[model samples]
Structures are given as structure tokens and as C-alpha cells.
Target: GSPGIGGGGGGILDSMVEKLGKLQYSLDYDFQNNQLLVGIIQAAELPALDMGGTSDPYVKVFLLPDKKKKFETKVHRKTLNPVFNEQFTFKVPYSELGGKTLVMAVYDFDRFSKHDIIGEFKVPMNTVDFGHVTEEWRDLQSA
Candidate 1:
């Protein structure tokens, strides 16, 4: 009953791409006033996390590999496709951001049970173009 697997119609490459790829987000840098880096985690179509074919999903953003500063979005219930549209900001200097990486994690929340991890995607600061707003759809690799 899985997507792109079992009796599914997609091929091997398609399956791999489905399993390990396609996460969309955006970013912007403001150098004029506050010297801030802004990020937008737009949306994601995640694989099922619950037995009922639904999940209570939320997103956590982190400035990695430092676990000190992080932000998260409000949890949405009973859905596989979650639209966050949440914005986060970093106040670090422009020169100090080069070594940092942004980590976005999608999690399934539960009331009486432990939170289950859905998947995660990360982008290094060095790969980002700070001159303009950048939007990209990247792969969601295993965490």
C-alpha cells in the first residue's frame, strides 16, 4: 500500500526520488537595517505517520550543528500535506553564518504518546545566495 513501492506504478528511480527528495522552502537576507536572515518553510507532502492514514504534524527549525537556538510552528492535525508558511530569523553576523546550516524537521505530534519523526531536510549557509531571495525544492533525506 506504499507509494512508488509494492504494487505502485512508479519505477526505481522514481521510487528513490520519492523516498529521498522533494522538499520546498525559501530564504531571504536583509543587509540594510537589521542584518537578519529570514527563512520560510512553505509546505511538504510527507509519507503517512499514523495507522489511521493521518498525522498531527509540526515543523522544527534549527541552526545546526548548535542545538541552542531553534524555532517551531504550530501543530496541524490529521493531515499528510502540511503547509507551514512560517518565518524564522537569525541575528548572527553575515560573516559568522557561513559555517551554519539550517535544519528543518517535520514531526508527528501525539497527545499521550511520544512524538514520531516524519523526515528532515537541511541546507548549508554556504550554498545559499544571500544577495537575493532564494527558493528551492530539496530532497528530504533520512534523519
Candidate 2:
């Protein structure tokens, strides 16, 4: 029921996008202090990377690949539908966001083990209402 990702590249449509999964979250900006506020709500039906359908998932958000800084949510057990009530802050100028593609990725967390990417979406900054709190659900897309 899924078609995922890896080396084969090009074209605008990567079916792996949907094969990944779903997430719901929100964003808001602070012009006065130059910050990006992010909220991690929940992710559902994530593909299993661990055995026995077990998963410890968490979400991470950052801008582009500059790696200037990043925000992470608290980990939650994987019923494949975990609810996360978390908020993260990104301190950067408002103008920078335009050139910054938002990287919101869902990762399968494992203690004493390697983590895996379940799903993610890199949103173009200009597409949203940054001045106000924008809450929405988006399907997953691979890098």
C-alpha cells in the first residue's frame, strides 16, 4: 500500500511522497524578535521501519540545509498515530524565511539504535500566512 524513496531521482512527482505519511501542525512568526514559531500536533499512519509495527516517533523542523539551528518535539510511542503537543522556536529574521524552505520531517526514534525518516514536507516559505498562526495538515514528501 506504499511506494517509497532513495537514489532514483528527477521529475516533480515522487510517488514516495505519499508513501511516506501524514502530519498536522501550525506556524507563526514574530517580526519584532525575528523568530519562527512552530507547533507539532500529530502524525498518523506512518510506515513502519521497526519490527513488530513498533515505533517511537518525533518530529523535527528547520530551515533549508543551512543547519543554522533546528527544533525537535518530544518523543511519543508509535501507535502509528501519535499525538504530540509541542512547540518549537526558530530565531531568524523574517526576510530569511523566504529563501528558507521549511523542513518538517517525521522520524522514527529508537533508543540505542538508528533512527529512520518516516515522512516529511519541505514547504516554500512564501506560500503561507506568516503574519498569523496558520494551522494545517499536509501529506508527506521525501527530500
Candidate 3:
């Protein structure tokens, strides 16, 4: 059953947050230094109902330069152990394609099987261009 995003139970949410430190639903990142800022409000527990368990928890990053075909290794998978509330940060090499339209997907890590998407958000890599960007990066020069 596809619960879709924002679909789950509060009881489950409470348990995960209370015990696993589930990355709050508001989990985010700073592309400048490739800093992944795990929030305390939006990150949900993996393989948990909030993340549409039954399916693997995963995140897919689609780099626009590679013909929109994921940066080759950007797609990541969370845990099905439910007990694992770990946070990860991958410094996207600046050597890859340099484009601002990077599509980030954070969901259950169920690859090559069924497709179950949980929480998903998109942010332009060039947040600096916006001027008022997150304090994560205040010195990045905008092209």
C-alpha cells in the first residue's frame, strides 16, 4: 500500500522520534559544503509506517547534468531495520556535473523491487544565488 508522502500515523511517529531519533521530516542539506542537515521535525523512521515500511527506504538524487539520470551514485537507501535512525551526508564531488537543478529524493530504501516513495523535497544547488540562504553557506559565490 502506497501511503504517499505525509501519510502515516502519529503513534508511529511518536515512537520513532522518541526512540530512534528519526531524522525529522524537515531533514535538509547544504549543497555548498555538501552538508546534509538532518532536521528534528520531518525526518521519519525507516521501514516504519511513516516511511511506508513494507518497502525499502531510499533517497534518489538526480543530477541535471547527467541528462537528468541521477549522478551515478546519488541514489541512497536508508535502513529496513527500523532500529537504525542514522543520518548520512555525502559530499557530492564538485567534479561531477555542475548544475543547480539537482533533484533530491529521500524515501524508503527499497531498490530494484517495488517503488515506495515517502518524503521528497527539491532544492536548487545554487541556494547562494537566492541571497538569503541557510547559514550553512554564506561565502559561496553565485555564478
Q: Pick the candidate with the highest lDDT.
A: 2
Candidate 1: worst-modelled 10 consecutive residues by lDDT: 14-23
Give the per-residue lDDT digits (tens) of candidate 3, residues 1-143: 47567665776766442332222222355657755443212234433566453434444555444453442222344443322233444355543324544444545444466564554444455552332333221111111
Q: Candidate 3's error at 96, in angstroms? A: 12
lDDT of 3 at 129: 36
Query: What's the C-alpha lDDT at position 18 in model 1?
Result: 48
lDDT, candidate 2, equals 0.79
Sorted by lDDT (best first), the order is: 2, 1, 3
Q: Whole-model lDDT for model 3 versus the true structure? A: 0.40
TM-score of 2: 0.77
Q: Please give the lDDT score at residue 114 for candidate 1.
A: 82
Candidate 3, residue 61: Cα displacement in angstroms equals 1.2
User: Model 2: runs farther than 4 Å from truth?
Assistant: 1-17, 48-51
TM-score: the better of candidates 2 and 3: 2
Our tally of clashes for model 3 stands at 15
Worst 10 residues of 2 by lDDT: 7-16
The parts of candidate 1 lying over 4 Å away from their true place are 1-22, 34-36
lDDT of 1 by residue, 16-97 (tens): 6445324567887677654555454555567764364777888788787776857888898887766777777777777878
Model 2, residue 80: C-alpha shift (Å): 1.1
